[PDB]
């Protein structure tokens, strides 16, 4: 397959690591990224808990909400980390290490 990643709107910040790897952006999760990946999962788990008390699905609804929130939070953390890496986000933490 012929792939070509390129943004029409160029990155405003330094553009280090134009095409990072999956495990690299996974390993670039800052404290803020972990915090925002955890808060979404917590909100999802508690919403799944509170919603599933009338039908009687006390726990499995919480597990399903946990799956949804975990996927969403990891997606958000990955999006922020990658966008910071390609450059078009305020980095101030990657140029320091690079």
């Amino acid at each position: 397959m012929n792939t070509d990643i390129t943004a029409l709107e160029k990155a405003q910040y330094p553009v280090v690591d134009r095409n990072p790897a999956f495990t690299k952006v996974v390993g670039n999760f800052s404290t803020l990224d972990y915090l925002r990946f955890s808060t979404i999962t917590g909100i999802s788990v508690t919403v799944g808990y509170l919603s599933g008390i009338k039908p009687g699905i006390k726990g499995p609804s919480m597990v399903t909400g946990g799956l949804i929130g975990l996927m969403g939070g990891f997606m958000y953390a990955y999006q922020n980390s990658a966008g910071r890496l390609m450059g078009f986000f305020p980095n101030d933490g990657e140029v320091a290490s690079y």
Partner: peptide, 30 residues
Amino acid sequence: PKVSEDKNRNYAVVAGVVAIVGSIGWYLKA
């Protein structure tokens, strides 16, 4: 009367409190 003795609600409560901590940090750290 020393333990809640519910192996299903406690995980929900800890999830709620860590969600609150995450919210306050996200407001503060950003």
